[PDB]
Amino acid sequence: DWDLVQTLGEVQLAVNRVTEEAVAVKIVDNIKKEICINKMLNHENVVKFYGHRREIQYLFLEYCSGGELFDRIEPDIGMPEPDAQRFFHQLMAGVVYLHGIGITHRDIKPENLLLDERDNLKISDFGLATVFRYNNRERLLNKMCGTLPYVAPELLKRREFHAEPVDVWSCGIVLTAMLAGELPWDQPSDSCQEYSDWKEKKTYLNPWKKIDSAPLALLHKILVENPSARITIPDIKKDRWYNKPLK
């Protein structure tokens, strides 16, 4: 038996009457695919799925008492570089896992990155997720989704696109936010001046000016317009800043 303590955001915090264990309960009244995908998942950097009950659908998910990464980002400032690097390491671990089982999240942003009691990052909310690889066969995506400031430019420009580079791009936007406390552009389109400036290498402007040359060098490889030229995760793991001892 579980008591519903408070509304988290619908999602409610539930506490076990006997054990006092806490869990997040998602109430819905597409949910079928979210449960299906959640049943595939098992990784320390992905919100745990405990099960579901049908009545109004109920999803039981890992409660992350640390809240959202979003709330650890000080506006216009960001966070200490060592904290950002640690969070970025854990984000990559989670994303590598998902891509490894052929799943793309499609909406990576600080609001969907939760923290447990130890500040361990957990990828959250698979309502927009989809399978991009099955029976070792890649499937190109063609539906536009995600969140504009975080979406890769190809999603706005091409009919079809590879799933993995899209997630890599969004991860680069998250890193920018962690290091500068602001988003670089409303969207990565040619009509967007801020994106034009970036493509023209005007890193003497914000937010790039607040970012140290080492992490900035990594962002130069992630925020590349051509998804085929964009750095892959295995190569991100070889990046100099990625491997820099910090703090």
Ligand SMILES: CCOC(=O)c1cnc2[nH]ncc2c1N1CCO[C@@H](CN)C1
């Ligand atoms: C301390 C605040 O941490 C949360 O609330 C929170 C904790 N664990 C969760 N697992 N799945 C979601 C979730 C969660 N929420 C759900 C509602 O939206 C977000 C909070 N405004 C994040």
